[PDB]
Design an enzyme around this catalytic site. Structure first.
Site, PDB file in Angstrom:
ATOM      1  CB  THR A   1      36.223  37.664  41.907  1.00 20.81           C
ATOM      2  OG1 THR A   1      36.996  37.239  43.035  1.00 20.81           O
ATOM      3  CG2 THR A   1      35.358  38.822  42.363  1.00 20.81           C
TER       4      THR A   1
ATOM      5  CG  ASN B   1      39.934  46.190  28.760  1.00 17.87           C
ATOM      6  OD1 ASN B   1      39.521  45.226  28.077  1.00 17.87           O
ATOM      7  ND2 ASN B   1      40.537  46.170  29.920  1.00 17.87           N
TER       8      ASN B   1
ATOM      9  CD  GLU C   1      12.739  49.447  20.745  1.00 17.63           C
ATOM     10  OE1 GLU C   1      12.468  49.169  19.589  1.00 17.63           O
ATOM     11  OE2 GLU C   1      13.224  50.500  21.090  1.00 17.63           O
TER      12      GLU C   1
HETATM   13  N1  LIG Z   1      39.456  42.215  27.814  1.00 12.83           N
HETATM   14  C1  LIG Z   1      40.014  41.981  28.967  1.00 12.83           C
HETATM   15  N2  LIG Z   1      40.132  40.733  29.421  1.00 12.83           N
HETATM   16  C2  LIG Z   1      40.742  40.661  30.647  1.00 12.83           C
HETATM   17  C3  LIG Z   1      41.238  41.720  31.418  1.00 12.83           C
HETATM   18  N3  LIG Z   1      41.790  41.262  32.589  1.00 12.83           N
HETATM   19  C4  LIG Z   1      41.647  39.966  32.531  1.00 12.83           C
HETATM   20  N4  LIG Z   1      41.015  39.535  31.391  1.00 12.83           N
HETATM   21  C5  LIG Z   1      40.701  38.144  31.023  1.00 12.83           C
HETATM   22  O1  LIG Z   1      39.825  37.606  32.026  1.00 12.83           O
HETATM   23  C6  LIG Z   1      40.378  36.371  32.547  1.00 12.83           C
HETATM   24  C7  LIG Z   1      41.129  36.625  33.815  1.00 12.83           C
HETATM   25  O2  LIG Z   1      40.370  36.580  35.010  1.00 12.83           O
HETATM   26  P1  LIG Z   1      41.276  36.861  36.353  1.00 12.83           P
HETATM   27  O3  LIG Z   1      41.911  38.192  36.294  1.00 12.83           O
HETATM   28  O4  LIG Z   1      42.205  35.704  36.488  1.00 12.83           O
HETATM   29  O5  LIG Z   1      40.260  36.767  37.487  1.00 12.83           O
HETATM   30  P2  LIG Z   1      39.079  37.608  37.971  1.00 12.83           P
HETATM   31  O6  LIG Z   1      37.932  37.144  37.089  1.00 12.83           O
HETATM   32  O7  LIG Z   1      39.377  39.032  38.033  1.00 12.83           O
HETATM   33  O8  LIG Z   1      38.738  37.020  39.473  1.00 12.83           O
HETATM   34  P3  LIG Z   1      39.742  36.098  40.417  1.00 12.83           P
HETATM   35  O9  LIG Z   1      40.040  34.753  39.764  1.00 12.83           O
HETATM   36  O10 LIG Z   1      39.134  35.722  41.775  1.00 12.83           O
HETATM   37  O11 LIG Z   1      40.980  36.959  40.554  1.00 12.83           O
HETATM   38  C8  LIG Z   1      41.357  35.882  31.503  1.00 12.83           C
HETATM   39  O12 LIG Z   1      40.680  35.105  30.539  1.00 12.83           O
HETATM   40  C9  LIG Z   1      41.902  37.189  30.949  1.00 12.83           C
HETATM   41  O13 LIG Z   1      42.354  36.986  29.607  1.00 12.83           O
HETATM   42  C10 LIG Z   1      41.114  43.018  30.921  1.00 12.83           C
HETATM   43  O14 LIG Z   1      41.485  44.050  31.476  1.00 12.83           O
HETATM   44  N5  LIG Z   1      40.473  43.076  29.664  1.00 12.83           N
END
Ligand SMILES: Nc1nc2c(ncn2[C@@H]2O[C@H](COP(=O)(O)OP(=O)(O)OP(=O)(O)O)[C@@H](O)[C@H]2O)c(=O)[nH]1
Ligand SMILES: Nc1nc2c(ncn2[C@@H]2O[C@H](COP(=O)(O)CP(=O)(O)OP(=O)(O)O)[C@@H](O)[C@H]2O)c(=O)[nH]1
Ligand SMILES: Nc1nc2c(ncn2[C@@H]2O[C@H](COP(=O)(O)CP(=O)(O)OP(=O)(O)O)[C@@H](O)[C@H]2O)c(=O)[nH]1
Ligand SMILES: Nc1nc2c(ncn2[C@@H]2O[C@H](COP(=O)(O)OP(=O)(O)OP(=O)(O)O)[C@@H](O)[C@H]2O)c(=O)[nH]1
Ligand SMILES: [Mg+2]
Ligand SMILES: [Mg+2]
Ligand SMILES: [Mg+2]
Ligand SMILES: [Mg+2]
EC number: 3.6.5.-
Lengths: 428, 426, 426, 428
Positions: free
Chosen positions: A134, A217, A243
Site C-alpha cells: 500500500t 515518527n 521556491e
Molecule cells: N518511521 C517509520 N517507519 C515505519 C513505520 N511503520 C513502518 N515503517 C517502515 O515502513 C516499512 C513497512 O511497511 P509496511 O508496514 O510493511 O507496509 P505498508 O507500507 O503500510 O503497506 P502494506 O505492505 O500493504 O501493509 C518498513 O521499512 C518499516 O521499517 C512507522 O511508524 N515509522
C-alpha cells in the site's frame, strides 16, 4: 496557500498520527476538534471544530481502525478514513493494481472534495514507505492520478528507505525499484529517510536505549512541520514550496534532497548546552546527524537550504554560512556556484508532551541535494540483482500480472538516475 | 512637483515602510494621517508625497505591490498602515518563486496592469509630476521582475519624468537563491535602458556599518532599512524644504550623469556612528565630509578608491555656511584628487538646504558615481556565467518561456556597462 | 602647534595614563573632559593636546595601542578613560610574547596600519602639527617592536615634525626577559635613525629616587610613572603657557643635538624630596639647580660626572628672575667645568616660563646629553653578545623570520653610537 | 585567551578532580554549575551554568564512573566524560594503539567542539603519568593528533615521574621512554613531577604522617592554577604562556622546566611565621622544597621564572633576586646571561576547605630549566637497560605489535636528550 496531507499505509498513517498530533500541539487543538485559535491545514466548520485536511488510506482495515479508536478520531472526519479489506501482501502488483485499483477512485474523490474545499491549494504531501505494498504500490497509482487532475500542484513525497537492518520484505528491493520509477515520473521532490540512521541518532543524541517507531515518527514529524508549518506561519524570510522546486532541482531528474536535522538532543544533554545558530548548523553538516544512511562527506553538494525556527538572526546565519564554506568539506559542484538558501521564521520549535527531546530555542532543518544519494541507490541495485538473478519470489508479482521486463526496466531507470547524479557531479 | 512611490516585494515593502515612517516624521504627520507639526514648512511642500484628505489628514502618494498577501498585511498592520488607503494595496496570491520570468514575464504582468491604472489615477490627481520612485530588490521575482515591468510601462507613459529606483544588490555573502544572479542580470538589462538612475545598496555593507560604526551586535533589517530610508529622505529634503542649492532631482540628474548608460549610484551617509562616541563628537562640515568620503560609511559594497570618480553629490541639511561647505568639499577633491577623473574639473557638487534631520544639527548624504561600481557587476556577471553555462535551474525559466538568448543578451549589456566604466576610468 | 601622543604597550599605557592625568590637571580638565579651570591660559593652548568637543569637553589627542585587551580596558576603566574617545583604542588579542619580530615585523604591523589611519585623521584635524610623542618600552614586543614600526611610518609621512619618544631602559637589576637585550638592540638600531630624540629612563634609578629621596618603602609604578609624567609635562609647559624663553621643542632640539646621531637624553627633576624635609626647604634657584645637577635626582641610570656633557637644558617653571637663573646655571658650568665638553662655551641653556606646577612655587626639569650615557648602551650590547653568540632563544625570532645579520647590523649601529660618544668625550 | 584541560588516565583525572575543585574554589562555583561570578576555563550556558572546558578520558570506565558519581558530575558535561571498556594493561602498545586508537577520534572531536567554543584559544594543558598505559600511551596518540589540527597552540604537559619507591609497573621504564620521545616530538613544555619528593614535602613541611594522592593532588593543582589562573586573572606583571615558550626554551629540545613551590607549610607551622617575598623565594631555591627528585645544587640554571600571588611588590622581588644571585649557588650557564623572569599577579592564594596548608598572603611558583634534570633521565636509562638486557616482559608489547628497534630507538633518543642538556650546560 493551503495544503493536503495524504497518508498511505501504516508507514504513512502512523507517521501521520504523529504529524497531526504535532499540529495539534502547534496550535492548541483539542482532540474533539475544538480549537481556539492554522488554516492551512485545517478547515473550520460552523461548530468551531477544525478538521485536518488529510486523507488516510489503508487497504487493510487494521491500521485505520487504530486511528478510529484513538483520541484524534474525533478530529478526523469519517470520510477521510478509508480502508480496504486486505493488504497488498507487500506487493506492488496488488498495491498498484489488483487491489488498490478498486479503492483509489474513492480516495481521489475525497481528495477532490478537499481540493474544492481549499481556496488556494499550494500543494500536498504524501507519506509512505518504499517497501510496502500500500505504501509503495498504491502510492504509485495515486500519483498517477493526482498528476492528471492537479498537475502543477506541489507533489512532496516522504518515503521510508528500507534499511538493511530492518527488513521486512524479501522483495523490498523489487517493491522499491518499481516505486522509484513512478516517483521519478510524478513527484516534484522526494525525501527518503532511513530508519536505521534515525535509530542511531536516537541512541546517541537522544540517548535512547530502545527506540520505537513512535519515537522515530516524532522526530520526523517535527522536521516536516519545520518545513511547512514554518512556512505558513510567517516569519522573517518566508520560503515557499515553489521556491524549493525552483531552487532545489537543477534538472528535471534530480529531485532527491535529503534531510538532516538538529538540535536532536535529549533534555538531559541539553542542559548545558547552548547552541548558537552556527553551532546548530555545524551539527547539521555532520553525517552523524544525517537522517539517511549515507556519507555527506563523500558526495558533493549542489543545493542546500537551511530553515530556521525561533531565535535566529540573519547576521548569525551569514556567519554560519561562511563557516560552512570555510570549514568545510562541502564540495559544491561547479554547476552551482553558491547555492545556499535561507529561510527564517519566528515560530519557535515545539515540544511534544511526553517527548524525548529537549525544549529548544532555535532549530534548524537542512535540506540538501548531494551526490551521496547515489550510494543508497547502489545498495538497492545490488540487492535487486541478487533476487532477480535467481528470480526468487518473482511469481508473487508475475502471478498477479506483472511483466518480467517491467522489473528489468525499473532497475535500469534507477541505474540511469544514479548515472545522472554522477554527471551532475562532474564538474565542468 | 510631485512624486509617486511604489513598493515592490518584501524589500520594497519593508524599506518603504521605513521610508514613509520617516517622511511622516519629517512633516509632523502622525500614524493616523493627521498633521501635528512644528512648522509651516512641513505643510508647504507636503504635496510631493501627500494628498490632503478631508480633515487635514494626509495620504501617501504611493502604491504597495506584491504577490504575497501576508507581507502586505504585515505592513498594513503596522503604524502607517493606517495612513495608506486601501486603494494602494495591490496584490496577488502566490509568489513568483524568485522567478523573474514569473514576475516580469507572466504572473506579475497580470497585476501590473491594475497597478498602472492606480498609478495613472494618482498622476491625474497630481498637479505636476516630478517623478517616480521605486523601491525593490535586484534579485527577487517581483522586486526585480514585476517592478521592471512596471517601470517599462511607466517610463513609456511619462518620458520626461524622473525615474529613479533604489534597489538591493546581491553579494556573495548574502545570496539566497541560485538564480539570484539570473534575476539580477535580467533586471539590470532592463534597468539600464529604462531608468534615469538607480541606487545600489548592498546589505553586506549595511551590516558592516551597523556593527562597525553603529556598534550593533545584531544588525536587523529594521535598522538596515532605516539607514536606507535616511538616504532616501535626504535626496528630497531640499525639494520639500527651502534651501539654497539644488533642490530638484532633475538638476541632480543633470549633474550626476555624464553618459546616458552610466546611471548607477553609490549612496552613503554622515553622521553615522554610535552614541557611545557621540559625546565626543563635534559636528562640523569637515567632520561630515570626512565621514561621507570614507568608504566605510558607504551603503554600497564598493570602495570608490579602487576606481575613479566621475561625479560626487553631497547634500547638506541644516544651517551651514557656504564657505565651509564649499571650501571643504573642494578640499576633498584637492586632497584626494587621485581618485577623481580628470575630465571633470570640480567633480564635487553640493546641495545645501536649511532644514536638519530630526535629532541632528546637521547631516549629509553622499551620492557617488565611481567606476569602482563595476565590481558589483562583476560579481553578478561572473556568477551568472557559471550557472548559465551549465544551464542549472534554467529550466525553471524556460518553463515560463524564457529564451537562452534573452539571457545572453542580458549578459551582453552587463558587459557593456562594465566596459563603459573602464572607458571612463581611465 | 599640536602634538599627537601614542601609548604603546603596558609601559606606554600606564605612563601615558599618568601623563594625561597630569595634563588635564594642568588645564583644569576633569575626568569627564569638562573644563573647570582656573585660568584663561589653561584654555589658551589647550589645542596642543586637546580637541574641543561639543559642550566644552576635551578629547586628548592621543592613541592607545596594544595587543592585549585587558591592559587597554584597565586604562579605560580608570579616570581618564572617559576622556578618551573609543576611536583611540586600537588593539589586538594576543600579545607579542616580548618578541620584536612579532610586534615589529609581523603581528604588530597588522594593527599599525589602522593606527596610522587614526594618526592621519588626527593630524588632519590639527591646524599645524608640532610633532609626535610616543611612550613605550625598549624591551617589550609592542613597546619596542610595534612602536618602532609606527615611528618609521610616521616619520616617513611627516619628515619635518618632531619625533620624540620616552622609553624605558633595561637594567641588570630589572631584566625580565632573556631576549630583552635582543629587543632593545633591534629597537635602538631603528630609533637612532628614525627619531629626533629619545629619553632614556631607567626604573632602577627611579626606584632609588623613590626611596632615597622620596622616602618610600614601597616604590610602585603608580608613583614611578608619576615621576616620568612630571618630566614629560615639564618639557611642554612653556609651549602651553606664556613664558620668556624657549618654548618650542624644535628650539630645544636645535640646542640639544650637536650631532645627528647623538639624540639620547638623561631626564632629571627638582624639587624631588619627601615631605618630611619639605618643611625645612626653601626653594631658590640655587636649590633647584643643586638638585637638578645632582646625579641622584636623575631619572636615567647614569651618572653624568662619569662622562662629559655636550648639552644641558634646564626648564624652569614659576616666577624666577632672569638673573638668578642665568647666573646660577652659569655658575653650575663654572663650578663643574670639568664635566663639560670644551667645544661648547655655554653648555647650559635655559628655558623659563611663568606657570608653576600645581602645588609648587617653582620647579625645574633637567635634560642632559652626556657621554656617560654610553654605559647604558654597554649594558645592552654586552648582554646581547652573550646571548647572540650562542643563539640562545634566537630560534624564537628566526621563527618569525629574522635574519642573524639583522641582529648583527643592529649591534653594529649600537657600537657606532658608543664610539661617537667616545669621540665627543674626549 | 582561553584554554582547555585534558585529563587522561586516573593520574590525569584524579589530578584534574582537584584542579577543577580548586577552580570552583577560586571562583565560587557550585557543583551544580551555578556560579555567580573565569572565563577562561568555563563557558556559560544560558542557564547560568558554567561548564568546565575539559575532556576526561579513561580507557577503563572505573575512574570516569567515580567522576560521574561525585559532586562535580553536575558540573561536567556528559560528553566530556569519555570511557573505553578495558585498560591498557599498563602498556603503551595498547594505550597508543591497540585500544586507545579506537576511542581517540571521539576524544579529538570533543576537543574540536571545545576548540570551536573558544574564541581565542591560547592553548591547552594535559595531565597524565609517564608510566601508565592510558596516561602515557594514549597521551602519545593524542598529542600526535592535536599537533596536526592545532599546531601552534600551547602544548603544556604535566607528567608524573615514576619513583623508585612507587612503582606500580615493572615495565614502567619502557612505558616512560616510549612516551618521552613522543613528548619531545610534540609538546611545548613538559613538567614532570615526582610523587616521592612531594611526599617528602608533605611529611616535613606539611607535617603529614600519611600522605595520599588526594593530598598530593591538592598541592599540584594549586601550583598549576598559580601558573594559569594567575595569568588569567590580571595582575601587575602578567605573563603569558607564549612568553614562557619564548623565555624558557633555548633550543627546541630543552623543554623540560621543573617546578618548586613555596610556601608549603602547615597551618600549625605557619603560625609564627611570616615569610617575605625574599624568604619564600629562598624556600623556592631549596632542594628540599623541590617537587622533583633531583639536586638543584648539582645542576646549573639556564632559565628561571618566578610567579607571585597576593601581596608582593616588585621592589621586594628585585631585592630577592639580588639575594639569589649573591647567595647562591645558582650557577647559570653562560649561554644565558641573566635569565630571571618575573610575573606578579594580585590574585591571592586560595585555600581548600579541609586543606592541609595554611592560608597564605603571598605565594611563589618557581619554574626552572636546569641541567639537573639529566639525573632523572639517567635513572630511567639504567632501569631500562636492566629490563631490556634480559628482555623480560618484552612480549607484552611485542605481542601487541611493537618492534624491538622501537625500544632501542626511544632509549637512544633519551640518551641524546641528556647529552643535549650536557652540551647546553657547557659553557662556552
Ligand atoms: N518511521 C517509520 N517507519 C515505519 C513505520 N511503520 C513502518 N515503517 C517502515 O515502513 C516499512 C513497512 O511497511 P509496511 O508496514 O510493511 O507496509 P505498508 O507500507 O503500510 O503497506 P502494506 O505492505 O500493504 O501493509 C518498513 O521499512 C518499516 O521499517 C512507522 O511508524 N515509522
Ligand atoms: N536591506 C534589505 N533587503 C531585503 C529585505 N527583504 C529581502 N531583501 C533582499 O531582497 C531579495 C529577496 O527578495 P524579496 O523579499 O524582495 C522578493 P520579492 O518578495 O520581490 O519577490 P518573490 O520572488 O515573489 O518573493 C534579497 O537580496 C533579499 O536578500 C529587507 O527587508 N531589507
Ligand atoms: N617605569 C615602568 N616600566 C614598565 C611598566 N610596565 C612595564 N614596564 C617595563 O617595560 C618592559 C616590559 O614591557 P611591557 O609591559 O611594555 C611590553 P609590551 O606590553 O609593550 O609588549 P608585549 O611583548 O606584547 O607584552 C620592561 O622594561 C618592564 O619592565 C610600567 O608600568 N612602568
Ligand atoms: N600525583 C598523583 N599521582 C598519581 C595519582 N594516581 C596515580 N598516580 C601515579 O601515576 C602512576 C599510575 O598510573 P596508573 O593509575 O597505573 O595508570 P593510568 O596512567 O591511569 O592508565 P592505565 O595504566 O591504562 O590505567 C603511578 O606512578 C602513580 O604513582 C594521583 O591521583 N596523583
Ligand atoms: Mg499495512
Ligand atoms: Mg515575496
Ligand atoms: Mg603586553
Ligand atoms: Mg586507570
Amino acid at each position: 496557500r493551503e495544503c493536503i496531507s495524504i497518508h498511505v499505509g501504516q508507514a504513512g498513517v502512523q507517521i501521520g498520527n504523529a504529524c497531526w498530533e504535532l499540529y495539534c500541539l502547534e496550535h492548541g487543538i483539542q482532540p474533539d476538534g475544538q480549537m481556539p485559535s492554522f488554516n492551512t491545514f485545517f478547515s473550520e466548520t460552523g461548530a468551531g471544530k477544525h478538521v485536518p485536511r488529510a486523507v488516510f488510506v489503508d487497504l487493510e482495515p487494521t491500521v485505520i481502525d487504530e486511528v478510529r479508536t484513538g483520541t484524534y478520531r474525533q478530529l478526523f472526519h469519517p470520510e477521510q478514513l478509508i480502508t480496504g479489506k486486505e493488504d497488498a501482501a507487500n506487493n506492488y502488483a496488488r498495491g498498484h493494481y489488483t487491489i488498490g485499483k478498486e479503492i483509489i477512485d474513492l480516495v481521489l474523490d475525497r481528495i477532490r472534495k478537499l481540493a474544492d474545499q481549499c481556496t488556494g491549494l499550494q500543494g500536498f504531501s504524501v507519506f509512505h514507505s518504499f517497501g510496502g505494498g500500500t505504501g509503495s504500490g498504491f502510492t504509485s497509482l495515486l500519483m498517477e492520478r493526482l498528476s492528471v487532475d492537479y498537475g502543477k500542484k506541489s507533489k512532496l513525497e516522504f518515503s521510508i528507505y528500507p534499511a538493511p537492518q530492518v527488513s521486512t520484505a524479501v522483495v523490498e528491493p523489487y517493491n522499491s525499484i518499481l516505486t522509484t520509477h513512478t516517483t521519478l515520473e510524478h513527484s516534484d521532490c522526494a525525501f527518503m529517510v532511513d530508519n536505521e540512521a534515525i535509530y542511531d541518532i536516537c541512541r546517541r543524541n537522544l540517548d535512547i536505549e530502545r527506540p520505537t517507531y513512535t519515537n522515530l515518527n516524532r522526530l520526523i514529524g517535527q522536521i516536516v512541520s519545520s518545513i511547512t508549518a514554518s512556512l505558513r506561519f510567517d516569519g522573517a524570510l518566508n520560503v515557499d514550496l515553489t521556491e524549493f522546486q525552483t531552487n532545489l532541482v537543477p534538472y528535471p531528474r534530480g529531485h532527491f534532497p535529503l534531510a538532516t536535522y538538529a538540535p536532536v538532543i535529549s533534555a538531559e544533554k541539553a542542559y548545558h548546552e547552548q547552541l548558537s545558530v552556527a553551532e546548530i548548523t555545524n551539527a547539521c553538516f555532520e553525517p552523524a546527524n544525517q537522517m539517511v544512511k549515507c556519507d555527506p562527506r563523500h558526495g558533493k553538494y549542489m543545493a542546500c537550504c537551511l530553515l530556521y525556527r525561533g531565535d535566529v538572526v540573519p547576521k548569525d546565519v551569514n556567519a554560519a554560512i561562511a563557516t560552512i564554506k570555510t570549514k568545510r568539506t562541502i564540495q559544491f559542484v561547479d554547476w552551482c556556484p553558491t547555492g545556499f538558501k535561507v529561510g527564517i521564521n519566528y515560530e519557535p520549535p515545539t515540544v511534544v508532551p511526553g517527548g524525548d527531546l529537549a525544549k529548544v530555542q532555535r532549530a534548524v532543518c537542512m535540506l540538501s541535494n548531494t551526490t551521496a544519494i547515489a550510494e543508497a541507490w547502489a545498495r538497492l541495485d545490488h540487492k535487486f540483482d541478487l533476487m532477480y538473478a535467481k528470480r526468487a519470489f518473482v511469481h508473487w508479482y508475475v502471478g498477479e500480472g506483472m511483466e518480467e521486463g517491467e522489473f528489468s526496466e525499473a532497475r535500469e531507470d534507477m541505474a540511469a538516475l544514479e548515472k545522472d547524479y554522477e554527471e551532475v557531479g562532474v564538474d565542468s | 512637483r510631485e512624486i509617486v512611490h511604489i513598493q515592490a516585494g518584501q524589500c520594497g515593502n519593508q524599506i518603504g515602510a521605513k521610508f514613509w515612517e520617516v517622511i511622516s516624521d519629517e512633516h509632523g504627520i502622525d500614524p493616523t494621517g493627521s498633521y501635528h507639526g512644528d512648522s509651516d514648512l512641513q505643510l508647504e511642500r507636503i504635496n510631493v508625497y501627500y494628498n490632503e484628505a478631508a480633515g487635514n489628514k494626509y495620504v501617501p502618494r504611493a502604491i504597495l505591490v506584491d504577490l504575497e498577501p501576508g507581507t502586505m498585511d504585515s505592513v498594513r498592520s503596522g503604524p502607517f498602515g493606517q495612513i495608506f488607503r486601501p486603494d494602494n494595496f495591490v496584490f496577488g496570491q502566490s509568489g513568483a518563486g524568485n522567478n523573474w520570468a514569473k514576475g516580469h514575464y507572466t504572473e506579475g504582468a497580470e497585476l501590473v496592469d491594475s497597478v498602472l491604472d492606480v498609478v495613472r489615477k494618482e498622476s491625474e490627481s497630481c498637479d505636476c509630476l516630478q517623478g517616480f520612485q521605486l523601491t525593490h530588490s535586484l534579485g527577487g521575482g517581483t522586486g526585480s521582475g514585476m517592478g521592471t515591468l512596471l517601470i517599462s510601462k511607466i517610463r513609456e507613459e511619462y518620458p520626461d519624468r524622473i525615474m529613479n529606483t533604489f534597489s538591493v544588490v546581491p553579494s556573495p555573502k548574502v545570496s539566497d537563491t541560485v538564480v539570484e544572479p539570473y534575476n539580477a542580470t535580467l533586471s539590470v538589462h532592463q534597468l539600464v535602458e529604462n531608468t534615469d538612475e538607480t541606487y545600489c545598496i548592498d546589505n553586506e555593507a549595511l551590516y558592516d556599518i551597523c556593527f562597525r560604526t553603529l556598534k550593533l551586535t545584531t544588525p536587523t533589517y529594521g535598522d538596515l532599512n532605516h539607514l536606507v530610508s535616511a538616504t532616501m529622505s535626504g535626496v528630497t529634503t531640499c525639494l520639500r524644504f527651502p534651501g539654497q542649492l539644488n533642490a530638484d532631482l532633475r538638476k541632480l540628474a543633470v549633474n550626476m550623469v555624464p553618459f546616458p548608460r552610466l546611471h548607477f549610484f553609490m549612496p552613503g551617509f554622515a553622521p553615522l556612528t554610535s552614541r557611545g562616541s557621540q559625546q565626543y563628537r563635534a559636528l562640523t562640515v569637515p567632520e561630515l565630509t570626512q565621514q561621507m568620503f570614507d568608504a566605510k560609511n558607504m551603503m554600497a559594497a564598493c570602495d570608490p578608491r579602487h576606481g575613479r570618480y566621475l561625479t560626487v553629490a553631497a547634500v547638506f541639511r541644516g544651517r551651514m555656511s557656504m564657505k565651509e561647505v564649499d571650501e571643504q568639499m573642494l578640499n576633498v577633491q584637492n586632497k584626494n584628487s587621485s581618485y577623481f577623473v580628470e575630465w571633470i574639473p570640480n567633480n564635487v557638487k553640493t546641495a545645501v538646504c536649511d532644514i536638519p534631520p530630526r535629532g541632528l544639527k546637521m547631516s549629509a548624504t553622499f551620492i557617488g558615481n565611481s567606476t569602482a561600481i563595476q565590481e558589483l557587476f562583476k560579481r553578478i556577471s561572473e556568477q551568472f556565467t557559471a550557472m548559465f553555462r551549465r544551464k542549472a535551474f534554467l529550466h525553471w525559466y524556460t518553463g515560463e518561456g524564457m529564451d537562452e538568448m534573452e539571457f545572453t543578451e542580458a549578459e551582453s549589456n552587463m558587459n557593456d556597462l562594465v566596459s563603459e566604466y573602464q572607458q571612463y576610468q581611465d
